Symmetry: D2
Subunit: 337 residues, 4 copies
Amino acid sequence: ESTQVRGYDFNRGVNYRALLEAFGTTGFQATNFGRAVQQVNAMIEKKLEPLSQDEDQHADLTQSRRPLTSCTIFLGYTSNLISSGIRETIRYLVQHNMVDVLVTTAGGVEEDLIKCLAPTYLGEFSLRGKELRENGINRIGNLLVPNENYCKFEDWLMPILDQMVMEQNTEGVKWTPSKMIARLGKEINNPESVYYWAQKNHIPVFSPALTDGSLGDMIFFHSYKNPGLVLDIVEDLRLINTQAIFAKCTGMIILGGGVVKHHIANANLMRNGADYAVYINTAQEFDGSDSGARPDEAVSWGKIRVDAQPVKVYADASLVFPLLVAETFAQKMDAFM
Amino acid sequence: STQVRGYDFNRGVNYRALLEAFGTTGFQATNFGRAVQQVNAMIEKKLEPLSQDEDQHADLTQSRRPLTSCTIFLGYTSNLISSGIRETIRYLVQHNMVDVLVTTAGGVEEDLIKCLAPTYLGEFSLRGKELRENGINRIGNLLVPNENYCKFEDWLMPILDQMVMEQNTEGVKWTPSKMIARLGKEINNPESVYYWAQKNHIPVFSPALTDGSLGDMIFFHSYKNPGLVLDIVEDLRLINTQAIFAKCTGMIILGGGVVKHHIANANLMRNGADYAVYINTAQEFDGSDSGARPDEAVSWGKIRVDAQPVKVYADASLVFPLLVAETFAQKMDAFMH
Amino acid sequence: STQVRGYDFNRGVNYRALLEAFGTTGFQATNFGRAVQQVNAMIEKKLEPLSQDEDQHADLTQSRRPLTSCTIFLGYTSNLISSGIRETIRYLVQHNMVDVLVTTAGGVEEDLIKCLAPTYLGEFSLRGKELRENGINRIGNLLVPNENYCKFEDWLMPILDQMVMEQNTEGVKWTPSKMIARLGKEINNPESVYYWAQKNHIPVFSPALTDGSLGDMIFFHSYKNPGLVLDIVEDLRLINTQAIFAKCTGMIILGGGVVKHHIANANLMRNGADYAVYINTAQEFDGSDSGARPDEAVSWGKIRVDAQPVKVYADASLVFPLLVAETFAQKMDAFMH
Amino acid sequence: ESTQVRGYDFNRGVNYRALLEAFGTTGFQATNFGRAVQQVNAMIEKKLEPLSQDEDQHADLTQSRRPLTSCTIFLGYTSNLISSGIRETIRYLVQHNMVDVLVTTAGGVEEDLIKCLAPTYLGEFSLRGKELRENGINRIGNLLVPNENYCKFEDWLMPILDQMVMEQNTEGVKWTPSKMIARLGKEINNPESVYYWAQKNHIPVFSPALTDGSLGDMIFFHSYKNPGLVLDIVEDLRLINTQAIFAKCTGMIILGGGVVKHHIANANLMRNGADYAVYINTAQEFDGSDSGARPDEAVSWGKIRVDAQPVKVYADASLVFPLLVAETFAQKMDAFM
């Protein structure tokens, strides 16, 4: 039962599918990439298995309109990836109903909406903050966002916050982050937006610290003009946890660390663990942080089943997530239509 | 022009002189020395008296806590509360040396649970399957038995019953910071960070408080005693007002994620912190907020252009007790009376 | 001003377009795109003809290898030769696409041994005790049986006997580069990097060649057949002359340590490389040469001030086959005839 | 058999010895630091055990004048640490004959000598290479070295290289790196120098790629004025390996990665493994590099005994090595005099 190390032979010419396939026998993180392709393809193939359970009960127990499949896939990603071109990548998966639950941080919501109003630009990591600040330019890694983008966001968002307060106070709406994100996706009304497609396809988005970013800034300023908006995080905890509890199987695809990683993993502890899991991040374990914990720490908690074969790829997801999608979801497009 | 020179142990082991020599040793030892200077600048500023004019503006908050000349925000990730840095943080809070805490849910939880049962030393390499089979959970190279959370459940559930009763019959509008104050009062134990925080009127912000064991318990509680609301909007106003009406601010941030961003974003509301120290092991190259250098925050206005912030690239379990030894602990008499 | 935009999989899986889209995706995907541009600039320069004047100066070396308009230095660490990147490197060397190799001792050794027996896939977490008890050596997530080195001993010892004989009776003055050429000729196998390097007159520098299995064998051999000398001074002249008399130079450096420094230092002798790509996962914060950004080398004169060098922060087992696919492999016809 | 997590209580005041002792129960890398203190103290205590073996045989078999002790300690460190203030730290250990073998890279030799002629200065990592180069300033991390330092080095070194060539050609001297380093230490004749003390105390220094740096540049330029110097690496392989083979016990203290780490570890494979080992570095395992390999990879090779209890501290050695020395060697100063 032994596989030999061998890399792609460019004497064959350039066949990119064969080149990507060769990662599996190349070693180090290339091999982990091949293992991740296999784990995600196992999630997809399980998802496509037919099932025959009670539609109305499920909906009652989860308080969700989304129909159950044979594998509930949780996709988590940090804010920076929505500032990156991986935004397109994630939007594709959600547009085609390929995942079931989204978890991201506040920036990961608002920068998708802002990109429908104005673009993000390429820059460099080493650009100095004094000069950028003096020019009204904000840096995100090697990306750049002008202050004017947030001005356009403000103008777009304040009338929606007005309606939200009115609906809460006179139509009994109890706002949560996931409910707000669904509404913003409907309002942005733009097929380039992740959250437009999420609400159209009844994919919920959880973001328990939704106030930590520009949407927070705007909610804050808005509240001195139109007081009273409340965002409850308790009901959203019930919604995410019941997505895990009532699943047939679950898979986790987690890009980055922080709350998005922990929140997906903790939901899956409710069912004594995910059946499949892929982490892609650059965090290291040695400082004891949750972000840097290997999948095998999650096993000790019951967040990943002891019989699962989870995979971590240690790499920037801007490089590896498009390749992963290319070899997995994008190959199964036939079945998602 | 300062020359590189390390401590000369031919002098013997003079600990203070050895620590002072980090400044001229280079690499992260020099950044450690710069961090000592930055924190001592925050303390020196904090102990200036407020002028009449400054006192007027600073008094503009409804906070019970007396205002000082430098409001210090201390942020830390959950793993650090599982570590012995819990004692370091507790000491600072106990003696009113910082003014605002920001942490994640684990960072609240695990302080309270340590008053019920201890955390143990283990190894990073322990395998999740065998740990899970023995009911032992791993946090880096630390270990918490399942039983710890059983005791937490027994302790917490009667409090949740009281909180719901107070909500529904006494008009209480819970937020994360108000719950954390109450949990600190209930734990009633001088070893607890949150006990001292509520005693000293130090607010604790944790916008994703539902992401861990507290969340598990609220979740199960919601089925027997439904309706608890935790609003994050009111807490956003509260943390942002702490920054807006400060005479000066300092940020001391251990780790990344929400704690780092939430503190920094609040300080953007005053066009930047005056002083800032980051201690973490995250790298910038993947674009993550966690790995962003202080100079990225300058571009946003989260750190003032004329500030001299510092990042120490190191595990805070090593650096933070040394930093406190060289700064706050040296001025303890000033924080007493 | 280039806008951020990721590949849109609604277009289908067009691999070339997906790779081209890394440039506008951000973070390290953008650095990957910049690295493709840098390497293609080296190749475009290499394929310019030499003017009369340039030909005159470049001809000033005693190298059998025809001079070109860009001398490309390729450096890589030993682990990459244990990986399937050995095939990638072999292809470039086979088709004369680079001009100078620099590696460590393992980087020589393990190429030769792979012609005698394979390397296998394993896992990073396998425990050393059980591996040692089974005579299995671990390299990251790769595995080499002890037997591999027995075969290497049987192969190498008769060659060492001949080298000593040629030293003592034919005046040969061995250096690392001369031994590596001889080992490549002896292995006589088209799967070997060093076979093709000596066939194509590509010198290989490895100033610490005694640091691994070759060293073990020289050591034991020294007791039966004493006196072998390996001079590193002559090799220093040889590598430095490759830089000094180049029309232009490019550096492609995979990993850190001696391979990175030795290539960069040689190029200081011409006041800097014209083009440079680093691929590695080292961080700058500990001051290590391995983690130093290209811009540190600019301060020394190792990279020209007007160059646009690039570092991709990633495991080269993922990135380097993609880089070659987008650069050298696209111009293969130009390197043939 | 369980130890509870507890940090230092600053309500005790500031006792730095107690603070450092508390690292052991603080967790994460603080705990690994405590384990490293224990491993190095075990090396020292073993070294001090008396022994009673044949003095003349030992010297014959090792071709060394250094007397055997009960534990042979190998100390390795990368170049950057000699540019840092850790130079003083290492010099102290060698001055007092506390370690037995030194391994470093070329920069780690020459920058100790240059510091006896002119100092290294503090700077910042972010200083731009163009401006530094235009001012004749070279950057090493956040340290700075003027070009003039290398001019002074040249003037000092060229007459010594003259004598070395003369002694080789007319007194039969066969130069190796360790023999050259001993001579340079004798010539520098300055008690601030590591290598002055090493040669005085008959501590050999191995550096198989000694030509990779400024000493190489100078040897290179010198050879066009005074040709013929040869530096053999084979005889130095015999000297380092016999230090391991004939030891009673061995310990490895390795700061950084690269050749210094591999070369010490490979020598100890000759005796089927070191009895004690401490690594301090910031390299990560996931790219398969030797630098980032955990001690447990070395166990699979036989480089560390299966019954050893090695320790890696993941941290910048500029921070932790002075603390480690303070708690170990500097406490045992009594016995080394």
